[PDB]
Amino acid sequence: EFQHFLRGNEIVLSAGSTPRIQGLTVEQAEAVVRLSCLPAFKDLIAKVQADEQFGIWLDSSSPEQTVPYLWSEETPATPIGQAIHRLLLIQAFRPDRLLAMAHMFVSTNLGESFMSIMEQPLDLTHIVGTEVKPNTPVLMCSVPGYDAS
Amino acid sequence: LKQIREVWNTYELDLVNYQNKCRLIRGWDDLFNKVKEHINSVSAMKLSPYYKVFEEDALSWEDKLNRIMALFDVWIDVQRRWVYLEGIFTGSADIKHLLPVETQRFQSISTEFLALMKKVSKSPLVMDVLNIQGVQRSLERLADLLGKIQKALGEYLERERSSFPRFYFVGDEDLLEIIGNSKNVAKLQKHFKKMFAGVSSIILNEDNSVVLGISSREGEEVMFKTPVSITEHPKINEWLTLVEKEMRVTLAKLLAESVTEVEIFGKATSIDPNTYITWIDKYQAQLVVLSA
Amino acid sequence: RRRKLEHLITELVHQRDVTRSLIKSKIDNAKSFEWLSQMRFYFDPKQTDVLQQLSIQMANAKFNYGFEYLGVQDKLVQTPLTDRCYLTMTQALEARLGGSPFGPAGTGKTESVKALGHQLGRFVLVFNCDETFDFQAMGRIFVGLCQVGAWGCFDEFNRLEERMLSAVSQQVQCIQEALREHSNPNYDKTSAPITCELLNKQVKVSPDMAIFITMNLPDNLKKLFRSLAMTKPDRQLIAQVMLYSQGFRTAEVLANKIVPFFKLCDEQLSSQSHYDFGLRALKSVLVSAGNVKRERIQKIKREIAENLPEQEILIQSVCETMVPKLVAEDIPLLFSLLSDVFPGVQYHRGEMTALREELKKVCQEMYLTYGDGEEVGGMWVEKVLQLYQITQINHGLMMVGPSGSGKSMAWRVLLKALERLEGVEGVAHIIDPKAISKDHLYGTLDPNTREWTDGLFTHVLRKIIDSVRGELQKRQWIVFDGDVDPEWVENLNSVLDDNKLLTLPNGERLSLPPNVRIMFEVQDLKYATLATVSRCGMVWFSEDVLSTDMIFNNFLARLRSIPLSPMLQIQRDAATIMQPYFTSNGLVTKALEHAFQLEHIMDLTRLRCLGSLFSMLHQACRNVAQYNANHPDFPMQIEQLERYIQRYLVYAILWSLSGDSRLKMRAELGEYIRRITTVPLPTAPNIPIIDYEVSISGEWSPWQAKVPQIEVETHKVAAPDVVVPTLDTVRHEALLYTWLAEHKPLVLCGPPGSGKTMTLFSALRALPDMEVVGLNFSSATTPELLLKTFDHYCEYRRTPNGVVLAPVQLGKWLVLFCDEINLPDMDKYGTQRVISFIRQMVEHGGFYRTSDQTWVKLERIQFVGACNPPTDPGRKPLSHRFLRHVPVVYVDYPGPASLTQI
Amino acid sequence: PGWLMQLEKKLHSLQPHACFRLFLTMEINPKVPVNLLRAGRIFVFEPPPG
Amino acid sequence: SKKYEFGESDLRSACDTVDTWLDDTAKGRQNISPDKIPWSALKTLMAQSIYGGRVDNEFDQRLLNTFLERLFTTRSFDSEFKLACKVDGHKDIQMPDGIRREEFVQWVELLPDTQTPSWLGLPNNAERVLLTTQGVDMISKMLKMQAWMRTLHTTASNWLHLIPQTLSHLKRTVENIKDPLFRFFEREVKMGAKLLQDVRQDLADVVQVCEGKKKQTNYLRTLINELVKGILPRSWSHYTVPAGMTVIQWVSDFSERIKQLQNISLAAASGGAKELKNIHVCLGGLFVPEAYITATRQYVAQANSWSLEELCLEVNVTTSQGATLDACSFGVTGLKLQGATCNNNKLSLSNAISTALPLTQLRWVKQTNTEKKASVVTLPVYLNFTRADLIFTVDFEIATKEDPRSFYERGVAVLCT
Amino acid sequence: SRFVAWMNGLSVYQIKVHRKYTGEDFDEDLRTVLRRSGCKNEKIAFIMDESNVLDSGFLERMNTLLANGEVPGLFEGDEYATLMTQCKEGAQKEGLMLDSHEELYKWFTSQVIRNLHVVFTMNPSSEGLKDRAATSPALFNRCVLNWFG
Ligand SMILES: Nc1ncnc2c1ncn2[C@@H]1O[C@H](COP(=O)(O)OP(=O)(O)OP(=O)(O)O)[C@@H](O)[C@H]1O
Ligand SMILES: Nc1ncnc2c1ncn2[C@@H]1O[C@H](COP(=O)(O)OP(=O)(O)O)[C@@H](O)[C@H]1O
Ligand SMILES: Nc1ncnc2c1ncn2[C@@H]1O[C@H](COP(=O)(O)OP(=O)(O)O)[C@@H](O)[C@H]1O
């Protein structure tokens, strides 16, 4: 699954990119053809032929909170398998939401508090008081056009 | 350790003739690399505990090699600075009148250095430069005197450059030629192209004592309304400042006259081609375009 | 007055455009920004101060016109890009900032900055940066800028080395930071002058100065410089204004037709290093067209008649500048583009019939071929005329072309013809760089003496300048017959350009008189800074300019004359027989064309095989004359001579064209000759013609008849023992005898251990008056080795009529057997010093002494070398300019039969 | 960058005081020596979007 | 189009300019006028000196001029003024009334926390493509944070098979040199054949060295190092390429270009002077696309007696493949409109990106030297999805509903790939 | 090599090279070995390693020496006079007559040919072997290559 996630979706093929659903475009169809080679699905065209609600899911504003079970394999009762399958599916359809879905795959793998610290602005009064040795200089890099002094 | 003894009795100073009937030392690689190799070798030999065959044979020569180094590292510097200062002081025949105290100081230094040169050339040998009593101390004295006179020359050059700052654009030898070779004006004109923009010459008088105007590289000329007089303004930088000031004022007056003439063309329904051509031929190009 | 009129036209066109376009758009208020945005001048003739009379305003910034005398500087066409550049630069200046235009090179950033500085009357200095930058001078030049009140500038600041870039950036940051303080609201009045730290001192900064940095910038200056994008100038408007200033009517149409034309010549034509289609070239073309139009007007008026075809003048000016630079295959492309943009106008050309007659008379006595139109030699004569045209324009023309093209003979014939016509003597000094160290080319100062010892170039230039014999009665032509690279050409820059002066490290200036041309005879042009190739025009020679038919005609003409009386008679009787084979068809040229598709080591050149063929034909002529001298009664009969020469020609063509390939290619060429020839051939089932010799009386005697099976003495079975005869040995014996009789250089290329050295030495036993000097070439080998060899074996330096180098022994010829002649290391400029040295002293028959700067001539020296196949590791290919003279021999490993016999 | 290298190589000398901290305002560019970057703690400040 | 730098220095310069010009015009210390403000001075100075200084291409200057003209008019002093014409179509952003900085600051602090690219005038779906690019970049980083003879050999053989064999570099003639299209296509085919031969030889050497049959040289060593890292070799890029491209994408694009050149060579062999015009070439598969435009112009000028510079381009987006192909019409395919759609020949703003244009027809009409109506727009034709190289500019009519400034500030363009 | 050289009656010579060796030091060592070989009729086994190689000048001198005996340009004028003195002393030691400079030089070259053997020791084959062959082919022609596995 990870191998397909990183580079396995960048393979090349001959044909099979026929459009089936008017809402499903040619690039999405060709991504489906790539994803079909993974035995974790073993069929994707048949699944999208039925369940016309999928088309509506293809136009949702946040189509990663809810995702239909297009994979038709043994039940991924463990949340990690469901999350990774859904992440691969999100890479297939609507890659823009991928990052958001990425967060979910982190959260369900590390709790819904892992990246919440970065969202809150930092307070150095604790970092420099204890975590910084007096011999270690604290560098404060700033993006050009901004000052952190 | 013997080979050192046989070889050190064979080096001369490898002298060359000079333009002003002198002698100079050119061999420095053989008189530095070989000597430092020898001193390293004798140090390695003597610091070795087995000196039963040279119990007192290396301390007798390590001091000699140290004296060779101490004399020659200053001798080379003295030679280079003296030849450079001789080239400076025997160029334009006016530095004898500009800073005469430096001229006489360098005369005395050159006299002493030529006495030393004759002394070494009479008996050329790498040991016959050690028997001269006070050769070392006189050498540092000559080095200090040459350094002081070179520093004084640099300070004088900076002082001259501070007035009429256009001298900052020219080099050092060019500036020396400018300040020195000033009695006659036939070599200053090759540096005017780097002190001004387009001023490639100066219109001298018949006896090159009064500056009447400026000439361009192609041949355009502007004639000063009040000529600059060198016969009444010596000290070249001063009359150069006068020339540039007269250039500014003459350009201003010519521009005023030209624009006054052009005001006729500006408000004329017709125009005579001959009059326009005469006006074009009268004034300079930049003045003409500015008038338009 | 012409330049003044041009400046007035350039200014008034912009004035009219501004007045009618940007002022007539319903504008009536003098304070409107549509008027306040232009460059306004206000003159007050009552202000006493000189620097307070003329006030120049751009948008809201007031500048006092510094009354610097700029002379006559060329103005710039005020394009809208130039207008916005002026506005941005003045806005930066008013905010006490610096202007930093950027963009691709060639859009006129430096020129725009300089023009703006001149418009306000400010002495501006441009620093080229790049390589000629003077890092030492900046310390005082910046102080001069600060105190004098000058303008200053920079050119391609990013092209500066990082450490000098950082130092200059710090200095300019300090200067600009000090300049920023003049606009302080609290410090509006300057009670204390602003001071800056440049040379560890307080330097007063005049408010009127500036700094401009034109790039193609460091973080220090990012908050101090107003950037500006100048990516493309308005070429159409510039061309239209320049053509209008030249008097051309319908100038807009001509500009609209010519700007796209130059936008095509860099897209359709094959890219070349010397191809320049920038705005500078366009301006040069326009001024040349104006001069041509005025010349036409003067010629017509000498029988205001302003009805000339201006498109014809424009295309003539374009052609007269672009045709010589073409590569002889883009000429149809150039004319197709011209017919595309100019629909129905043809390029007419001058004739110069007097020069045509002079060239014909000179070529008739030099055994060359002359042609006026499409006949043989027409292109070569056209190239010579183009060279003459470039001679009168520039002084640093550099003829370029692949080896074998007739460029050396071109300028030799031109010099002779000009001497005959103009009546002034012609002298040419063929100086060859990269064979002499650059230190001994320009000269050197010994630091312990300050003595100036001039090098070869400085010596000959000083001899020209000093009127010892003649400085203006002759025409000195310093020709640099050798490939170029930016190591010595950098010192020649100040001579090629308009300065026409050479500076010396000892502080001396040498101005060459207006009768000296600095010509280059190169073949690659691939290692040269654009500054060198841009400071001087050039004419491009090509391989097809010199056809093979002219080579054959020259060979036959030099055979019917120049005795190798009875010798010349036998040469003529043989030339008559060989004439039907040099008819641009038939035998020789068909085989020459067919031999260019065969696998040849040391890739073939048309002038190498032909030279070998001519040498061996000369050997045949002297052989048949030797036979005639052998029998006093019954001299050599013409009938037998015919059939002797007819077969010796085939023997020579086989051993010259296929003399550097394996037996397969030799057999293939033999079969091709069998298929195309008409002369009698040996009657053998499968034995190749390579295994036969054209014996005297005209028979194909098999080489096997000269293989004496001998038994060597028992005690000597070693290498010093003479060779045991075999086919290859006894064949290479005759071949090397043929090539050594005429004192021709030789190269034996073959795998190691094949027997090249042994075969050469065995051949050298037959010759009884040839001494051998064996040199072992290797990496890091330089022409000094040959100099030491000459000092060891050629002590004579007598001067009867010039320095002549001769061997110590009388009546003997030395052969310098340079083993592994292609082994010497090739430097990073694609050349070998020793190869160029041994090429100059073979082609020109001498060289230059580095000590006394004199032309020493060879007397009895000859060159033979050994090699390995160039594909062998550690071996590098030889230059074509050197390979052209040396015929190479491929000595392969002896076959099983040869090994058994040996 | 050279003076920054000098500072970082000086910092290897022990500074006995415990309350002494050295804050270095920094620009995100590769010209900074890697030695200081590895030696000291790093913080990155960005302008919030919108 | 470029990642410019619009740091604080430009804002300081703009503030200084505003201060200077407002003080110069408004000598009166109190309210001066809604109309006497030197709007033209401010607009020109921002557009040409301080903000437009860093702008290289013409279209970014056009966008900056559009923004400055929309924002810096006297209408901004009116009580009602839309800073953003349409956020969600019906949602507008009103100009906050006030004469002192406190109310403006209060307005800024009371801005809704929701923010969409429509506030910037961009299409509302720009966030989508931005997020897609960010996700692809994240995948690339993770891949970069993740013997090999066997791994490289299989993919090298796959690339060798995928790339077509050597093309027929045989376009030779004697009476078709006068045809500019033949010249351009001949040089294109020659360059393609040379590059294909070099790539094929290098790939075969890589295949054989991955099998351990020959000792790698320095050039082969660095080529293999480039290949294993997934970075396109430097020695292969002889034509314009998007900045950053994996070797797989480059290999596929090169295979497509070689296929197109093979078809062109076959058509030339069939004809030679009459079929080169009738061919339907895609501008993305050519090493020098603008050279094709120049050659087409040359051929059109050669057919008649007109000069090359008297012709103007005209674009017809013919539906499907009409195959009209007039004497001056030329067929180019693969062009994609960005953020706009064309019905017959008129543009219309769209919320869906990358609309495909089938069989664009380029005609060279002898221009009448007249000013076109103020109802057309000039669209750039870039080469890559990264708009960093201009080929030419088309002139397209628009539906009467929209205005050209919306097209300018929305960022519509034509892409060849 | 040392064992067989001693057992053959050959004085082993070696170069103790440090990082401060230059071309001139190697020229002096070659002058010493040639004086020991030509003059005094002493056979020498000049053995050196690839580690005893630092500059291409070493291999250039080896190329000039291994082939055709004498090294051209190795001796300057003073060195020429000195070598002539030692070689004439050796010639009168053997008994040959003193006629001219040339025949003393040729006797010296013949003695060097007969009484000198150069041994190189190198690490197994790499691109270094190709480079060494390129800079000097003598060690592939004059020197017999004996692999020592
Ligand atoms: N009409 C002709 N004009 C010029 N050369 C001719 C003509 N006919 C025959 N030749 C021969 O062509 C050759 C011209 O060689 P040239 O010296 O001009 O070439 P180059 O390119 O300057 O030389 P190199 O290859 O050594 O650099 C000569 O061998 C000359 O005899
Ligand atoms: N506005 C203009 N008017 C006239 N000539 C121009 C103009 N702009 C550029 N040029 C010409 O372009 C040539 C090259 O400009 P150059 O100084 O090399 O610019 P850069 O140094 O930025 O490449 C100059 O010789 C100049 O004559
Ligand atoms: N009669 C002969 N014919 C051909 N080859 C021979 C003959 N006699 C000896 N040889 C071989 O030719 C070789 C020539 O050696 P050498 O001249 O050093 O080779 P090269 O100069 O070709 O590199 C000898 O090693 C010897 O084995």
Record: contact E134-A99, CB cut-off 8 A: yes
Give the residue among B40, B39, B121, B24 at the shortest CA–CA distance from B81. Answer: B24
The dihedral formed by the CA atoms of C465, C471, C475 and C476, expressed in degrees to the nearest 10:
-30
State both tokens at A113. 């508090």
Between helix E126-144 and helix A98-110 the angle, nearest 10°, is 50
With a 6 A CB cut-off, is C153 part of the ligand 2 pocket?
Answer: no
Find, in chain A, the residue whose alpha carbon is nearest to that of D48.
A146
Between helix F23-37 and helix F101-114 the angle, nearest 10°, is 90
User: Residues 6 or more apart from C382 whose CB is under 8 A from it?
Assistant: none
Residues in chain E after which the backbone breaks (C–N beyond 2.5 Å): 146
Q: What's the CA angle centered on C752, arms C750 and C757, to 5 degrees?
A: 75
With a 6 A CB cut-off, is C860 part of the ligand 2 pocket?
Answer: no
- Phi, psi of C502, deg, nearest 5: -110, 125
- Find the C237 Cα to ligand 2 centroid distance in Å: 13
**Are the C-beta atoms of residues E308 and C343 closer than 8 Å to each other?**
no
Q: How far apart are CA C413 and CA C601, in angstroms?
A: 35
State both tokens at C191. 């009670």
CA distances from E101 to E26, E98, E104, E109 (A): 19, 8, 5, 12
Beta carbons within 10 angstroms of residue B259's beta carbon: 19
Residue numbers of C between 216 and 255 with CB closer than 8 Å to E: 222-223, 226-229, 231
Distance of CA C293 to the CA centre of its chain: 32
3-state secondary structure chain F: CHHHHHHCCCEEECCCCCCCCCHHHHHHHHHHHHHHHCHHHCCEEEEEEHHHCCCHHHHHHHHHHHCCCCCCCCCCHHHHHHHHHHHHHHHHHHCCCCCCHHHHHHHHHHHHHHCEEEEEECCCCCHHHHHHHHHCCHHHHCCCCCCCC
Give the residue among C760, C774, C776, C767 at the shortest CA–CA distance from C723. Answer: C760
Between helix E180-210 and helix E218-228 the angle, nearest 10°, is 90
State both tokens at A37. 């080679």
F80 touching chain C per CB within 8 A? no
CA distances from B264 to A53, B144, B270, B280, B292 (A): 88, 71, 11, 14, 11
The enclosing domain of B77 has a CATH number of: 1.20.140.100
- DSSP letter at C705 equals G
Distance of CA E25 to the CA centre of its chain: 43
Q: How far apart are CA E245 and CA E319, in angstroms?
A: 33
Q: Looking at beta carbons, which pairs linking C334-340 to residues 24 or more positions away fall under 8 Å?
A: C334/C265, C334/C269, C336/E177, C336/E178, C337/C261, C337/C264, C337/C265, C337/C268, C338/C261, C340/C264, C340/E180, C340/E298, C340/E301, C340/E302, C340/E307, C340/E308
Find, in chain A, the residue whose alpha carbon is nearest to that of D15.
A135
Beta carbons within 10 angstroms of residue E384's beta carbon: 16
**Are the C-beta atoms of residues C435 and C833 closer than 8 Å to each other?**
yes
Q: Name the β-bridge partners of C503.
A: C509
Give the residue among F133, F108, F107 at the shortest CA–CA distance from F120. Answer: F133
Find, in chain E, the residue whose alpha carbon is nearest to that of A91.
E135
Distance of CA D33 to the CA centre of its chain: 10
Give the residue among C143, C99, C35, C853 at the shortest CA–CA distance from C440. Answer: C853
Find, in chain E, the residue whose alpha carbon is nearest to that of A62.
E128
How many CA atoms does the CB half-sphere of C366 hold within 13 Å?
Answer: 20
Beta carbons within 10 angstroms of residue B35's beta carbon: 19
Residues with CB under 6 A from ligand 3: C 719, 723-724, 726, 729, 750, 752-758, 866, 894, 902
Q: How far apart are CA C100 and CA C113, in angstroms?
A: 10
Helix (H), strand (E) at residue C859: none
One-letter amino acid for residue C589 of the chain: T
C704 touching chain E per CB within 8 A? no
Burial of C634 (0-12, 13-18, 19+ CB in 10 A): exposed
Q: Where are the alpha helices (DSSP H) in C747-889?
A: 756-766, 784-793, 833-843, 880-883
Q: How far apart are CA C354 and CA B105, in angstroms?
A: 71
B191 touching chain C per CB within 8 A? no
State both tokens at C229. 């994008």
- Note down the domain range covering B110: 1-180
The answer on whether C876 is annotated among ligand-binding residues is no
Record: contact E40-C341, CB cut-off 8 A: no
b/e burial code for range B141-171 (CB count within 10 A of at least 16 → b): ebbebbeebbeebeeeeeebbeebbbbbbbb
User: Residues 6 or more apart from C836 whose CB is under 8 A from it?
Assistant: C432, C434, C435, C482, C483, C879, C882
Q: How far apart are CA B292 and CA B266, in angstroms?
A: 8
Beta carbons within 10 angstroms of residue E261's beta carbon: 26
C332 touching chain E per CB within 8 A? yes
With a 6 A CB cut-off, is C577 part of the ligand 2 pocket?
Answer: no
Record: contact B216-C71, CB cut-off 8 A: yes
Q: What's the CA angle centered on B45, arms B43 and B49, to 5 degrees?
A: 110
The closest ligand to the CA of C129 turns out to be 2
E136 touching chain A per CB within 8 A? yes
- DSSP letter at D44 equals E
Quote the radius of gyration of chain A (alpha carbons, Å): 21
How many CA atoms does the CB half-sphere of A60 hold within 13 Å?
Answer: 16
Give the residue among C368, C403, C359 at the shortest CA–CA distance from C552. Answer: C368
CA distances from C373 to C379, C403, C545 (A): 8, 24, 13
Q: How far is C600 from chain E (nearest CA, A)?
A: 23
Phi-psi region of A15 (alpha: psi -120 to 50; beta: other; left: phi over 0): beta
With a 6 A CB cut-off, is C839 part of the ligand 1 pocket?
Answer: no
Give the residue among C570, C596, C592, C586 at the shortest CA–CA distance from C679. Answer: C586
Task: Supply the DSSP string of C824-853, one letter for each residue.
Answer: S---TTS--HHHHHHHHHHHSSEEE-TTT-
Give the residue among E405, E180, E156 at the shortest CA–CA distance from E292. Answer: E180
b/e burial code for range F89-107 (CB count within 10 A of at least 16 → b): ebbeeeeeeeeeeeebbeb
Between helix C606-630 and helix C566-578 the angle, nearest 10°, is 130
Record: contact B197-C121, CB cut-off 8 A: no
State both tokens at F60. 């250039």
- Note down the domain range covering E113: 1-133
3-state secondary structure E124-168: CCHHHHHHHHHHHHHHHHHHHCCCHHHHHHHHHHHHHHHCCCCCC
Distance of CA F139 to the CA centre of its chain: 13
The enclosing domain of E108 has a CATH number of: 1.20.1270.280
Q: How far apart are CA B220 and CA B202, in angstroms?
A: 11
**Are the C-beta atoms of residues E150 and E245 closer than 8 Å to each other?**
no
The answer on whether C513 is annotated among ligand-binding residues is no
Give the residue among C401, C641, C639 at the shortest CA–CA distance from C522. Answer: C401
Q: Whose CA is nearest to atom 18 of ligand 1?
A: C406
Classified as helix, coil or strand, C31 is coil
Q: How far apart are CA E359 and CA E334, in angstroms?
A: 8
Q: Which residues of C touch F135 (CB under 8 A)?
A: 778-779, 874
Record: contact E49-C91, CB cut-off 8 A: yes
Please state whether beta strands B201-204 and B210-215 pair in parallel, antiparallel, or not at all (unpaired). antiparallel
**Dmax (CA) of chain E:** 89
One-letter amino acid for residue E337 of the chain: L
Burial of A97 (0-12, 13-18, 19+ CB in 10 A): buried
- Find the F127 Cα to ligand 3 centroid distance in Å: 29
Residue numbers of B between 83 and 142 with CB closer than 8 Å to C: 83-84, 87
User: Residues 6 or more apart from E93 whose CB is under 8 A from it?
Assistant: E82, E83, E84, E87, E119
Q: Name the β-bridge partners of B215.
A: B201, B221
With a 6 A CB cut-off, is C7 part of the ligand 2 pocket?
Answer: no
The answer on whether C744 is annotated among ligand-binding residues is no
Structure-token match 């011999």, residue found: A135
Classified as helix, coil or strand, E411 is coil
Q: Looking at beta carbons, which pairs linking C242-245 to residues 24 or more positions away fall under 8 Å?
A: C242/C77, C242/C283, C242/C286, C242/C287, C243/C286, C243/C289, C243/C290, C244/C9, C244/C13, C245/C5, C245/C6, C245/C9, C245/C10, C245/C13
Resolution stated for this PDB structure, in Å:
3.4
Find, in chain D, the residue whose alpha carbon is nearest to that of A146.
D47
Task: Supply the DSSP string of C55-101, one letter for each residue.
Answer: EEESSS-EEE-------SPPP----HHHHHHHHHHHHHHHTT-EEEE
**Are the C-beta atoms of residues C820 and C867 closer than 8 Å to each other?**
yes
Q: How far apart are CA C644 and CA E395, in angstroms?
A: 79
Beta carbons within 10 angstroms of residue F13's beta carbon: 20
C551, C555, C836, C879, best to mutate for ligand 1 pocket (most atoms within 8 Å of CB): C551
Record: contact D41-A138, CB cut-off 8 A: yes
Q: How far apart are CA A91 and CA A79, in angstroms?
A: 18
How many CA atoms does the CB half-sphere of F122 hold within 13 Å?
Answer: 18
Which residue from C84, C256, C342 is facing E48, i.e. has the nearest CB? C84
**Are the C-beta atoms of residues C362 and C425 closer than 8 Å to each other?**
no
C845 touching chain F per CB within 8 A? no
Between helix A98-110 and helix A79-92 the angle, nearest 10°, is 170
Method: cryo-EM
Give the residue among C403, C415, C431 at the shortest CA–CA distance from C355. Answer: C415
b/e burial code for range C372-385 (CB count within 10 A of at least 16 → b): eeeeebbbbbbbbb
Q: What's the CA angle centered on C462, arms C456 and C465, to 5 degrees?
A: 145
Q: Given the CA of residue C721, which atom of ligand 3 is nearest to it?
A: 8
